[PDB]
Amino acid sequence: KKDYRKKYRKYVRSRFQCIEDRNARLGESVSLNKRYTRLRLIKESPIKMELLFDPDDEHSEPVHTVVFQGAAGIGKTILARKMMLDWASGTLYQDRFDYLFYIHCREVSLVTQRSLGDLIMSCCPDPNPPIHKIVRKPSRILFLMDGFDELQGAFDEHIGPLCTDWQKAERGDILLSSLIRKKLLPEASLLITTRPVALEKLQHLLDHPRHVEILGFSEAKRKEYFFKYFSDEAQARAAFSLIQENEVLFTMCFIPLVCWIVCTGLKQQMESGKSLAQTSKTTTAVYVFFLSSLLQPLCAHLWGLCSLAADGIWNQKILFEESDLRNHGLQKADVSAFLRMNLFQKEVDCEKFYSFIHMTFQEFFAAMYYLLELPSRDVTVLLENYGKFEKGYLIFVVRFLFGLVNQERTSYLEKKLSCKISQQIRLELLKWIEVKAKAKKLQIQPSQLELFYCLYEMQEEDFVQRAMDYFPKIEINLSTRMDHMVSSFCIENCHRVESLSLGFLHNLTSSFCRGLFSVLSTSQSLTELDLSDNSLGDPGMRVLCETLQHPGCNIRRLWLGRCGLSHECCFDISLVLSSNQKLVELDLSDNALGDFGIRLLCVGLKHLLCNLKKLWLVSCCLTSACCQDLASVLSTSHSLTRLYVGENALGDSGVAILCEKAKNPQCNLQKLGLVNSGLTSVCCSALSSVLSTNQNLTHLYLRGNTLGDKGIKLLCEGLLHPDCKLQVLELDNCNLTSHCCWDLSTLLTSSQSLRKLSLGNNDLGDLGVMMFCEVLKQQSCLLQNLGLSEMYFNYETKSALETLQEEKPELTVVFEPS
Amino acid sequence: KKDYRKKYRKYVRSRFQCIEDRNARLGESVSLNKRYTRLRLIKESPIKMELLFDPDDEHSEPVHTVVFQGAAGIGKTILARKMMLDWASGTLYQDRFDYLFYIHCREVSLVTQRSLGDLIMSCCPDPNPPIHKIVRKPSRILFLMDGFDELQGAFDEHIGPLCTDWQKAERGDILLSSLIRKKLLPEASLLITTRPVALEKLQHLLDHPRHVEILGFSEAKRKEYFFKYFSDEAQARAAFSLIQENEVLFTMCFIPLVCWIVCTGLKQQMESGKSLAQTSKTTTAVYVFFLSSLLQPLCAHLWGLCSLAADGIWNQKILFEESDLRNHGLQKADVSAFLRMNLFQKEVDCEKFYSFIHMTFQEFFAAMYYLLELPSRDVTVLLENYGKFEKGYLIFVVRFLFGLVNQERTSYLEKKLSCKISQQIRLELLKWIEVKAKAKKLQIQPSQLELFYCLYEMQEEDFVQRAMDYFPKIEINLSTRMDHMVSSFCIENCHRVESLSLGFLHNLTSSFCRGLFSVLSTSQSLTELDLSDNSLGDPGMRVLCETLQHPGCNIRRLWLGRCGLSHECCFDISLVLSSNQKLVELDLSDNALGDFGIRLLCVGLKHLLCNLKKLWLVSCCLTSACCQDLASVLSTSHSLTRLYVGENALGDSGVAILCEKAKNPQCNLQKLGLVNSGLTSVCCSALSSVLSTNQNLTHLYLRGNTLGDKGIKLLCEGLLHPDCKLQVLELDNCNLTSHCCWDLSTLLTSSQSLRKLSLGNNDLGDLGVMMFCEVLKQQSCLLQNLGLSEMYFNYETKSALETLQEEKPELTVVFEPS
Ligand SMILES: Nc1ncnc2c1ncn2[C@@H]1O[C@H](COP(=O)(O)OP(=O)(O)OP(=O)(O)O)[C@@H](O)[C@H]1O
Ligand SMILES: Nc1ncnc2c1ncn2[C@@H]1O[C@H](COP(=O)(O)OP(=O)(O)OP(=O)(O)O)[C@@H](O)[C@H]1O
Ligand SMILES: CC(C)(O)c1coc(S(=O)(=O)NC(=O)Nc2c3c(cc4c2CCC4)C=CC3)c1
Ligand SMILES: CC(C)(O)c1coc(S(=O)(=O)NC(=O)Nc2c3c(cc4c2CCC4)C=CC3)c1
C-alpha cells in the first residue's frame, strides 16, 4: 500500500529547507537551501557529490566509506544538507540507495547504552517504521556521520566488544565503532565529516577510506555570496567592495563561516544606519567585532556566558539545559537577547536543550573567560590539554586566547580583559611555543603550523619576533592563500632561521608563491631552501629565479625534487648562476632538464664568479651528447668540484668525453658521480687515465654499471698508479665476479691512498671474501666499510669476517651480512 | 621503500647455484646448476614445469596440489632446485607467485612444537620478514616439500587436532598435515616430492593431487651428462664408451645418482692413472666398487660407520652430531677423509650437523653392518620392519643385503663380510621371499616386484632358481629398460611358473618388449600369458607372434585386452595359428579387428592342425558380413567349439548365416555367444533349427538382444524338440514380456535337457514368477539359477520363491532379488 520509503523522502525533502535548521534566523525567516553556494571539492583533480561510492578506473572495486575533511566552518554540514535535499528530491543517488539517514554527532550519547535506534530517531515522527523489513537490507542504505570530532565523553578505537547485530544495545561509542568499521549492518555506505586533526582517532576505524578535501570559496563565489545574501544589489556591491579592499579579511572570508560573520555584521550596520566600516584583520578581530557589535546595544552577562562556555568545553558539554543557564546567572534576560541575535539558538528540531551557533564561537567564549576579571580558569591547564581528542583539541580556545592577549585594546568588550591576567598569560603562551617549537614530532599537537597561525593572530612585533627564536628550522605545508599570508608574515620576522622546507598543495604552477619567495630572499639568516617534490612548473621556478637574484639573499643551498621542471627553465637558472655568487649547492635532479637544458645551464656554470660547487643532474633525461658541455664546465670553471650525472644515458661514449677533460692535471673534480650510467669495461681505460692524473679526485661512485672483471681490472691498473689519490671507491652493482678477486686483492695489497672500498652484490662468493680477509691483515690501509652488501656466505667465511673485525680493530666496519 | 619480495628473490638466486648445495664438492668447487640436465616428465603425454598449477582443458578448475613421484636419486630435489632458480630468475611462475618457500623434510622436527616459522627459517638471515603482511596472503605463495618419505619419528594422517592458524604452535607432524590438506594457509600452492612407496601415507592428505612421474635420462641425455661432467672431450668419450659397452651398467645409469657414482669413480681412476676398467653389473656392485675404491687408499673405520648408519636407520636419524660420531669411535681421522671424498658432507648451509651424501648410501652402509664381523644386528628384525613408513621402508637396506650376501667375493671391503653370517642370512632371505611371494596382496610390502629386483642383485643360480619356486603366478608392471632387464632375468630362471601377467607402462608400440617375449617362449612351465589392457600396437603383436611360433612355447592360453590391435595384425595371428598346435584359448576382444581382420584370421582358423577351441571376437567392430567366414570356420574346423561374437553388429541377417552352418549335425559348436548382437524374433527360427539339429550345443547366451515373446516362443519350439540337448539358456536383456510366461512354462514343463534357465530383466511381473513356482514343482529338471535378475516383486511372490527353495532342495538357486 503506502511505502514508507516514499513518506521518508517527503519528510527529508520538507525538513531540510533551512541552511541553519535552527531558530533565531533573523526574525525566524527562512534562509532557504536554494541559496546553497557550490563548494570546491578535491579528491586524493575535482570531485562531485555524484558517484562518491562508485568504482574508479581500475579493478572495478566498490567504495563503502568516503571521508570529507577540511577547516572548521567550511560547510561540511551544509554539503550534507544539500545532499539530503537532492536525494529526497530524486536527483542525487536516486538509483543507488533506498534510504538516507543523517546522524549528527553533537546529539549522540557516547556513554549511554542503546540499540541502533538511530534509524528511527533520525527519521519520521512515526514510532514504527519498517526497520525489520526493507530498512535493514544491507548496501541499500546511505548514512552520514556529521562531526566525528564533536563526539563527547571518552572514546576509543581498539575495542574488543565491537557490538554487531543492530538489535542489541551497547554503549554509544562502541556502537559507532562497529558501524564505521562496517561490522554492524555490513556493506552499508557511510559518509563521515571530520576535522583533519581528529583523523588520527578515526583512521583506525576506516581502514581504507576515500579521501575528499573541502575547500573554501573562490573569489567568484565570494562575490556571489554577497549578492545572494543582500537582497538589494546596491548593498551587495557596497558590502563586497568594502571587504574586497581588505585583502586579509577577504582572504579569511574564503571560509564560509567567516564570510557569514562579516556579512551579518555589515547587514546590522546597514539596518542601524551606521557607516558600515570594518577594520578587522585577524580571526579574533572578526569574532570580537561581531560579539561586541551585537551585545553593545547584553554585555552585562558576558562573564556568566564565558564561564558557561569554558565549563562546557572542559566538561565536554555542547548541549545545555535550563539548569545550566540558571547556574551561571543566565535567566529571563540575556538568554532571550542571545536568541534574538545571531549568537545562540534554542534547538527547535522537536527537542529540549540550548546550544551555541558554532563550536568556534563556544571555544571563542571559553578563550575570553580566561582573561576576564568555572572549571579552572587556568591557562596552564588549557594549554596542557591541547593535544587531546576528548577536549576537542582546544585549537580555537588557545588560538583566540593568543589574539585576545594583547595591549592594543579598546572598548566594545576588549576593555573587560584584565591587564595583569593577560600579561601573565602572554608569558605562558610564549613558553608554550618554545616547548612545542622544539618538538619535531608528528601528532595532534601543533605540527609547526598552528603555532604560526597563533602568532599571526597575535600580530605584535615583540611577542612574534621572540617566538621565532625557537624555530631554527621550519617545515610547513601551504594549500591556500591564507596559509601563504601567515607564512610570509611569520618568516619575515624570523632572524634566526637557518633552513626552510616548503610543501605546496593544490591551491600550483603560478605566481601564488611570489608573496613568499619575495620575502625569503630578504632574509638575513636563511641559508637553505628546500622545495622538494612540489609541482612548481617553469613559472614557479621563474618567480624563484627572480627572487634568487636579490643581493641580500644569503641563500647558499637550493634543493629541488620531483618538480617536473622543463629544459626551458634552465634559461632562468643560468641567469641566477651568472649573478648569484653565494649559491654553493644546487640540486636539479628528478626533472626533465634534458641535453638542451644542460647546454643552457652550462652557460651559467661557465660564467665568471659562478661559485657553484655541487651540482646534481641525476635523472634528468640526459644522454652522452650532454657530456660535451659538462666536460667544458668542469675544465672551464674553477669552482665545480662535485658532479653527479647518474640515472641517465651517459654510457661509455659519454663518459669518455668527461674523462678527456676530467683527467686534466688542473681539474678540480673531487667526486665523480657516474652511478647508473650503464658503463662497461670499454671506458674503464679512460677512467684509469683520470684516476692516475687528477690528484684531486677522492670519490668514485660506479654503482649501476656493468664493468665485469675486465672493467675493474682496468680501473685497478689506474688505482695502482703512484699518483692516484682516490680515498673512496664504491663498487656495488657493477656486475663483478669472483674472477676479479685477484685484482681486488692486488688493489688492497698495493693501494696506499684508499681508505674505503665497498664491494656490493658481486659474485665474489666465499673465495673472494676469504681471500680479502687474509689480504686485509697485511698492513692494509683500508679502514672503512668493506661492503659485502646483499651477500650470503658460508660458516667459515662468516667466522673469518667476524674474526677480522676482532683481530684488527683499526678496521671500523667489516659489515657482515648478518 | 625496499620490498622484501625483491630481497628474497635475490637471496634465492644467489643461494641455489650449486647442485648438491653441500660441501665436499671435489675440492669445494662450484658444481653449477647451469649444468642441469633435463628430466623426462610424464603426466597422469609429457609435462613441463610451466603451468603445473594451471587448469586443464575442461571445467577450468585450478590445481592446488602437484605431486612428483619417481625412483630414489631420480632428481626430484634437483628438479625442485632448478624450479627455484627459474622462479627467482623471473622465468618460471613469474606472473603467478610472489613467494616460493623450499622446505626440506630431512631437517623437519616431527615431534617438536612450533608455529609456522618455516616461512622465516627457509629464507634469508633477516629475522623479521613481513610475515604479517604480504607473506600471509593465500594463493600468492608456492611451497615445495622435499622428501615426504624422509620425515622422521612417528607420523599419522588421521588427526583430529589438525592445527589451523599459522600463528599457533603445534607438533611438526600435525603442522605438516594441516598445510598439505590446505587447511592451514588455504588456497596456497604446494608441490610435494615423494617415493611411490610412501604415497599410501600421503594420499590421505592430498585428496585430489595432480600426478607427475619423473623418469631418468635417455641415451642422448646420458651422453650429455658425461660430456658436461668431464671437461676433456677425450675423457668424456672414453668414459661414456666404457659404460656404453656395459649394457647392464649403461641401463642402470638412467638414474642420475647411478651415472654420478659411476662418473665420480671413473674421474678418480683417471686422476690416479689407472686403467679405468669397470666391471660392475648390479647396483650393489656399483656401490661397493665406489666405496671401496674411495676408502682403499679409511677402510679401518668401516665398522664404526656401518654401525652408525644402522643405528641411524633404526632410530630414525639422518642428521648426526659430533657426539654421534664420537660414540662410534669416529673422530679427527676418517671423518675428515670422508668429507674430503664424495661420501659425507658436514652441511654447511649455516648449520651444525653431519649427514650422509645420499640416503641410499646410508641404507647401503646399514646393509653391510649386518654382515660385518649397534641397534640389533639382526636381519630377522630388519626384514620384519620392511613394511613400515617410520623406518623408511628399508628397501635398499634389504636389497643391498641381498646383493652383498654372496660367495663370489673379493678384496676391496668385500672380504670384511663374515662367511658364517652371510650363510645364515642367505637362508633367512630365501625364507623371507617364500613368505612374501605367497602373499598376493596390495601394500607397501613387496608387490612381487621388489622381490625380483633383490634376486637380480643376488645374481646366483642356486639362490635365484630356488626363489622362483614360490612364484607359480607372476603379476608384474614394467615401465623402463631396467624393469625388462630384471623381468627377463628372473622369468628365464622360473621352472615352476604356470601363468604370467604383464603390465606395460609408457617406456609403447615397439620392440622394447622383444627381450622378454623371446624368453617367455622358451619357458617349459608357462601355460598362460595375460597381456590385458596394454597399448601394444601391431609392432608389439608382431614381436609376440614371432615368439609364439617357437616349437618350445608350451603356451596354451593367450589373452589380450584393450590393446587397440588393428585388423592388419590378423595376418600375423593367422601365422601363429597355422603352426602353433598348442594354443587352445585365444581372446582377441576389445580390438579393432574388423570384418577384414576376421577374413584373414579365418585363414589360420581353417588351417590344418589348428587346435584353437575357444575364440573371443567380442567388441571387434564386426558386422553381419563377417558371418560368412566365421560360419566357414565353424563348419571347416573340427577344433572350434566356443565362439563369442557379441558386442558387434551381427544382427539377424548375420546370425542366419552362422545358423545355416552351425545347425549342421556334424557341427562341434558347444557355446554360442550371441550376446549383444541386436538380434530379434526373425532369426529365432534359424536358432531353433540349430537347437534341434546340433546335439553338441549346450549353452546359449542371448543377453542384449530384443526377441520379445515371439522370439522366445520360436526358440521354445526348438528347445521342446526331442533332439535338443541345450543345458544352459541365458535370457536376461532379451526384452521379453509377461505374455511369454506360458511358453516359458511349457518350456519348463516339457524340457528334459535344460539344467539352467536364467530369466533376467524381463517384464514377467508377479504372474510370471508365480506360474513358474508351481511349474517348477512338477518334476522339473531345472536345478540351477532361475534368474530373476534386476526384478522386483510383491509379498506373495517373494513368499512363493522362498517357499520353493525350501520345499524343493534339489533347486540350488532360486535367486530372490532381496
Ligand atoms: N555552501 C554554502 N552555501 C551557503 N552557506 C554556507 C555554505 N557553506 C557554509 N555556509 C554557512 O555556514 C554556516 C553554518 O555553519 P556550520 O553549521 O556548517 O559549521 P559546521 O562546521 O558545518 O558545523 P559542524 O562542525 O557540526 O559540521 C551558515 O551560515 C551557512 O550559510
Ligand atoms: N637433472 C639433473 N642434472 C644434473 N644432475 C642431476 C640431475 N638430477 C639429479 N642429479 C644428481 O643428483 C645428485 C644429488 O642427489 P639427490 O640429492 O638429488 O638425491 P635425492 O633423492 O633428490 O635426495 P631426496 O630424497 O631428499 O630428494 C647430484 O649428484 C646431481 O648431479
Ligand atoms: C590547513 C591546516 C593549517 O593544516 C589546518 C587543518 O585543519 C585546521 S583547523 O582545524 O584548525 N581549522 C581552522 O583553523 N579553521 C579556521 C581558520 C581561520 C579562521 C577561522 C577558522 C574557523 C572559522 C574561523 C584562519 C585560517 C584557519 C587547520
Ligand atoms: C618403479 C618400481 C619398480 O615400481 C620401484 C620399486 O621400487 C622402487 S624405489 O622407490 O625403492 N626406487 C629404486 O629402487 N631406485 C633405484 C633403482 C636401481 C638402482 C638404484 C636406485 C637408487 C640408486 C641406485 C635399479 C632400478 C631401480 C621403484
Swiss-Prot record, chains A, B:
This is NACHT, LRR and PYD domains-containing protein 3. Keywords: Activator, ADP-ribosylation, Amyloidosis, ATP-binding, Cytoplasm, Cytoskeleton, Deafness, Disease variant, Disulfide bond, Endoplasmic reticulum, Golgi apparatus, Hydrolase, Immunity, Inflammasome, Inflammatory response, Innate immunity, Isopeptide bond, Leucine-rich repeat, Lipoprotein, Membrane, Mitochondrion, Non-syndromic deafness, Nucleotide-binding, Nucleus, Palmitate, Phosphoprotein, Repeat, Secreted, Transcription, Transcription regulation, Ubl conjugation. Its EC number is 3.6.4.-. It is an enzyme of class 3 (hydrolase). Residues 64-372 form the NACHT domain. It comes from Homo sapiens (Human). Phosphorylation at Ser-589 by CSNK1A1 prevents inflammasome activation by preventing NEK7 recruitment. Phosphorylation at Ser-139 by PKD/PRKD1 promotes NLRP3 inflammasome assembly. The modification Phosphoserine is found at residues 29, 31, 45, 109, 139, 178, 511, 518, 589, 758, 818. One of its GO terms (molecular function) is identical protein binding. One of its GO terms (biological process) is positive regulation of type 2 immune response. Predominantly expressed in macrophages. Also expressed in dendritic cells, B- and T-cells (at protein level). Expressed in LPS-treated granulocytes, but not in resting cells (at protein level). Expression in monocytes is very weak (at protein level). Expressed in stratified non-keratinizing squamous epithelium, including oral, esophageal and ectocervical mucosa and in the Hassall's corpuscles in the thymus. Also, detected in the stratified epithelium covering the bladder and ureter (transitional mucosa) (at protein level). Expressed in lung epithelial cells (at protein level). There is a cross-link at residues 168, 274, 661, 710, 756 (Glycyl lysine isopeptide (Lys-Gly) (interchain with G-Cter in ubiquitin)). Its main location: cytoplasm. It catalyses: ATP + H2O = ADP + phosphate + H(+). Changing residue 23 to A: Impaired ability to activate the NLRP3 inflammasome. Sensor component of NLRP3 inflammasomes; inflammasomes are supramolecular complexes that assemble in the cytosol in response to pathogens and other damage-associated signals and play critical roles in innate immunity and inflammation. The core of NLRP3 inflammasomes consists of a signal sensor component (NLRP3), an adapter (PYCARD/ASC), which recruits an effector pro-inflammatory caspase (CASP1 and, possibly, CASP4 and CASP5). Homodecamer; inactive NLRP3 forms homodecameric double-ring cages that hide pyrin domains within NACHT-LRR rings to avoid premature activation.
